[PDB]
Amino acid sequence: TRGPRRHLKRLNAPSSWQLDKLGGKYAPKPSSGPHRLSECIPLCILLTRKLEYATTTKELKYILRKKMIKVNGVVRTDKDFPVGFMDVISIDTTNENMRLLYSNNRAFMLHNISSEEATYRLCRVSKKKMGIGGIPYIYTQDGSTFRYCDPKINVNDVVKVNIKEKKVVGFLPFKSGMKVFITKGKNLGCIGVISGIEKHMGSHDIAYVVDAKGRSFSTRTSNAFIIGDSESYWISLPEGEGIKISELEKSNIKYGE
Amino acid sequence: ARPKYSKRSRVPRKPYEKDRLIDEMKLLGEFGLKNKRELWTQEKICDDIKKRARDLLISTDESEIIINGRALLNKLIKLGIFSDVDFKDMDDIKRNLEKVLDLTASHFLRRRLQHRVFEACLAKSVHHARNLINHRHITVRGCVIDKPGYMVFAENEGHIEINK
Amino acid sequence: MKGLYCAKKLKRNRQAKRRNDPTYRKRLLGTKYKQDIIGVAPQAKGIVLEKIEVEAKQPNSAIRKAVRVQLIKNGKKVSAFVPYDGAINDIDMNDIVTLEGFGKKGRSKGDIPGIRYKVCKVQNVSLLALFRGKKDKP
Amino acid sequence: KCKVRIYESPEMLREIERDFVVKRKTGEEVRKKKARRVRKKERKEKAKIFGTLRRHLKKAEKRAQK
Amino acid sequence: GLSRSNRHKRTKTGAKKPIFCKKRKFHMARQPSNTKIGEDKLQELRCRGGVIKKRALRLSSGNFTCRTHGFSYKTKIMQVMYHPSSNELMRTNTLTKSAVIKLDSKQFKEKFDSILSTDSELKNTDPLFFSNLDAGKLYGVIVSRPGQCGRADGYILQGDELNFYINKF
RNA sequence: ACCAGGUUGAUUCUGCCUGACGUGUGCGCUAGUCUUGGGGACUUAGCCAUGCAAGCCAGCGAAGCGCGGAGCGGCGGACGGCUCAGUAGGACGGCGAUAAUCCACCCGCAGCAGAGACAAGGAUAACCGCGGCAAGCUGCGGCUAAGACAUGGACAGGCUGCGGCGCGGGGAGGCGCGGGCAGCGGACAGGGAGCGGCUGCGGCGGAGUUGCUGGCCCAUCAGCUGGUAGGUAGGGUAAGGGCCUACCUAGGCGACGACGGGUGACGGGGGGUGAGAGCCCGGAACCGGAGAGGGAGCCUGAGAAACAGCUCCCACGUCCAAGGACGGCAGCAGGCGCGGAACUUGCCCAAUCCCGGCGGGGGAGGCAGCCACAAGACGUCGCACGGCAAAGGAGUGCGACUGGAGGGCAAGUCUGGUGCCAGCAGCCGCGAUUCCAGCUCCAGGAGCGCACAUGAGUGUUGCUGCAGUUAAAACGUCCGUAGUCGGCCCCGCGCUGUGAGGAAACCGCGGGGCCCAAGGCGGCGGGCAGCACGGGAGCGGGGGCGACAG
Ligand SMILES: [Mg+2]
Ligand SMILES: [Mg+2]
Ligand SMILES: [Mg+2]
Ligand SMILES: [Mg+2]
Ligand SMILES: [Mg+2]
Ligand SMILES: [Mg+2]
């Protein structure tokens, strides 16, 4: 129909959430917070389907009432809060710090990280705009915004921002030869090094990526999230490490080569 | 939404072929089936397996015979009873995929525990040895079955015995 | 019209050919709407007007026990043939009977001429129930 | 197969768990919640009443007295 | 009310369109605020999205600049001398955009003689504009849209832009 | 990747009819168990009794006896649900555009006037009384709150005109920002349960416009068009626009099918059926659109031209004390009507989720009931247990029809009746191997038969792939324009490969001992003559031949 859609059907839910067909008619509609709906999952999926702390919404209401959940260092006592890629969920009960990240199966996965890796997160910039009075403040893809950054930070760059401090502590540029994470597409959840950038004046810059295994693929640069320069990875890598093993490789391990 | 479903059986195109109508019934009276639908289910299930193999032998991608062909043969071996393929990747798949096309419907009809009870001389009376399955006397390793079209597997085939 | 750029001419031409196909001709004309008896909807139900004497097509020599029936949904007066021997005495005047086709795509079946529909139920109970005595007419 | 929970206090049990399972163990019935058909008519009468109930019932019986 | 849709229009080929749905507020237009001269009355409208649009119903003065020297005053509007789209709009003295209007010359001639005191050559550069100033005729165009902004701002006509317009009225 | 019966004395054909198979709609007969799904779409977007379906709150907090909960204030009610009338492009799908635009929740940022400021003014509802009135509804008086409505006070953002260099971004600019002169204008006087207001930038969530393109039939619809096509200018709008107006050009579309008509036409994801090319269907889960008896107009709001909002008209219907007052079940059950054709006026928020700042609400939704409507599996009565919101079921645990029997077509030249009657039979046919029974037998089997529609059968619609001497069919001839097709030699475009991006459901595949199965659940794939890159050939362009082309 027309207007702000309050409901969300279960089949219309993103398949990255991994909701079953027969779970119900409706899926939890996310609140309209920091990440886009195509690139987010609610808290209420993670606390019942991933971490399984609550089996019931009554248990889930209690967990967010007592405010033990905390994502990106803020308490966020909302059932449908959209947590997205690179965001860090830190629960002081259980002392469990996790970073939301994709998997090889094209689904969201909670990757357990250290207490020290939880102190920061990575954010891809959206635009760069001078504010009133000459403040050059940039805007990230997850809706965060930071001022007085490095002037070399231009579009499609990822910045390492502190959590407990609102500043940006680290900068990573978008060149060739950078460790990239593929956020959207057929190659979702693949980690590779950028080989070439094709500019395509007018629309849709294309990035050419080969992975660690050597498999080459092409994506849009808007689906390219830098996670490291040539020497280092700025985050921990999840289980499987973004290799996206082929179907014949899945066949060859079962029956021999 | 809705759980999906399918049609297990099909009917023949010419329903009164006197050649077919007794070749059905000897394949039915061998295993003591309830109806022709029980026979036509396995005649369908064997057919699209044969139809699966014929589209793999035609294939240009040799990855397809690797992925789906070994999957088809393991389906024939593990849950089915085929029990002879090595999966070596030394093209014994194509030696065995052309053995898929000679498989009959009776090759699948023997696999049911209605027949497998008779295979170990357990109840001796197939035309009413199903009475023992229907009243829960046959028990596989720890579980009882009242479904005579159970389609026992490779490993389970020895472990059948009567219980009380 | 067999050149590589003749597709719009071939669609224009073969559609005009297809209008001469008799099966497609009825869907194009909408004859199942022009007669609302049995085409668009099965099982027409109507009120019996009189019992009809109609004789079979020769060489066969018999008398089929047809009835005129005025439909409820249309008011159309169509004749319908009664099967199932002796059933014509079990149906009476001002009954409300349901009519079915013959399985002949709108034509007459066998020796009967002109009669394109046949009765199956009288006063919402079937004639197979009355030919053997399974049910009772209210 | 049983999926069973091991709590540490009776108060966290009756708080976290759903109200029907504590009716299974002990039969609390702490909230009556009369019936669904009664609570609908009880609320739907209260909706048309503007003001307090006592002003509305007084004006009603004053007209009923006349 | 008035609409903005082309659902009543014909197509490019001239075919008539069928009108079926009820009118939407997505494409609704309004009356022309035929802004005239008088004491200032602006109409406030909660238009689409709650934003307040002010249209001028009557309008007394306009913030008019002299582009040659970069100074401005709000001189009073006297009459519309020329309107480009219709001469009906100048007969009624309707203040719209691009309407050549006769301004109050008093506030502008005070600074114009003051700069003419220092630079004597200024009057000779465009003699026609300073010809009408001593007669008291000063003309400007509205550049703002008074039905949208609620103001009648513009610039003083000078130069060849002036002799273009005085041939038009 | 199939044919069989039927024109003849017999034959070979053409040819259609019919059988044989799937599918879905209805009927009929019949019926043991379980799981799962579906079910007033078609006719009547027909009419509706009764009940219920959208409410909530934390600011202020009256009555009532600190508790309390009224009203104010706020948020939602524009979502879901239902339906498919309209709609042949205002849709939808694919690819875009918005440098032509607006915005609530929420998120991230910056901020919020010293004014007497240890501070804010008049009200009103609730309430206290007094009433009117059949009812629906409403008046008078008296007081009294604020995160309601004001006052106070302008550092900025903002608006408009003019000026105007740069620095950033973008494919492209006064788009952002800094620097100017004017005219406007404009963000905290809140609270001892967490805070809450307001302004701006950036999102998110929406939304409006919009480009290209694709998709039914009719030529017994061939020309159509006047705001029509364009220009200038203004208006109007959130916003580009003939959107509108003023003046002016004479355009615009069309056999590459305009225009007009038809549709028992919502579109799509898809479904059915076929070896395939195809043909047919898409009411129906998800997405988009549209509607709420027919209409039109609007208020409030961020968002409605809203309908379980208003105003009016129309058509139906109801109550009245005769002054007036009301009703819109294409929400959920249920009734009537319609028809061939479609369930209980059950229980509940337990699950799925939504509104609300939480305790609340939810006929969304689930559970059960009804129905052989469908898929799948399996046969020929009461405790305890078990599960369940609750109950019931699952799980332990004890004490046989339906149709036929001449051929097609499987199975009777058995018995009795019937004697061209009655009847049967899709076709051929019979009048006792065909009627009607009995027996036996056959087919499928808890299902089966029938009708209708559709696909295949059908190379009887023919692109693949028909036929046109005589079977149906070359127009009497010739000219002829669009159309379609077209000689030889010697960057652009078609075509094509890969890739991007593309929802799930579905489908294909693959697992996966739900007891099996249909499944559930998890993997992997496909879709697009749009986009990007690649491509040795093909075509253009231009010369040279001069074709048993002219
Ligand atoms: Mg009062
Ligand atoms: Mg008063
Ligand atoms: Mg319609
Ligand atoms: Mg549809
Ligand atoms: Mg819909
Ligand atoms: Mg002829």
Residue numbers in the entry:
A (entry chain SE0): 2 to 258
B (entry chain SJ0): 2 to 165
C (entry chain SX0): 1 to 138
D (entry chain SY0): 68 to 133
E (entry chain SI0): 2 to 170
Which passages does the manuscript contain on this structure?
A consensus refinement resulted in a cryo-EM map at an overall resolution of 2.7 Å, with a well-resolved large subunit (LSU) and a dynamic and less-resolved small subunit (SSU)–head region. A 3D classification focused on the mobile SSU-head was performed to improve this region, resulting in 2 states with either a rotated (State 1, 37.7%) or non-rotated (State 2, 39.6%) conformation. Multibody refinement of State 2 improved the local resolution for the LSU (2.83 Å), the SSU-body (3.03 Å), and the SSU-head (3.27 Å). The high occupancy (92%) and resolution of this density allowed for its unambiguous assignment as the eukaryotic hibernation and recovery factor Lso2. In P. locustae, Lso2 is a 77-amino-acid protein comprising 2 consecutive alpha helices (α1, α2), separated by a small hinge region. While the N-terminal extension occupies the mRNA channel in the SSU, α1 superimposes with the D-arm of the P-site tRNA, and α2 sterically blocks the T-arm of both P-site and A-site tRNAs.
Here, we use cryo–electron microscopy (cryo-EM) to solve the structure of the ribosome from Paranosema locustae, a species of microsporidium used as a microbial insecticide to control grasshopper and locust pests. In this study, we provide the first structural analysis of the P. locustae ribosome and demonstrate that it occupies an intermediate state of rRNA reduction between yeast and V. necatrix. In this state, energy is conserved by inhibiting ribosomes via a diverse family of proteins known as hibernation factors.
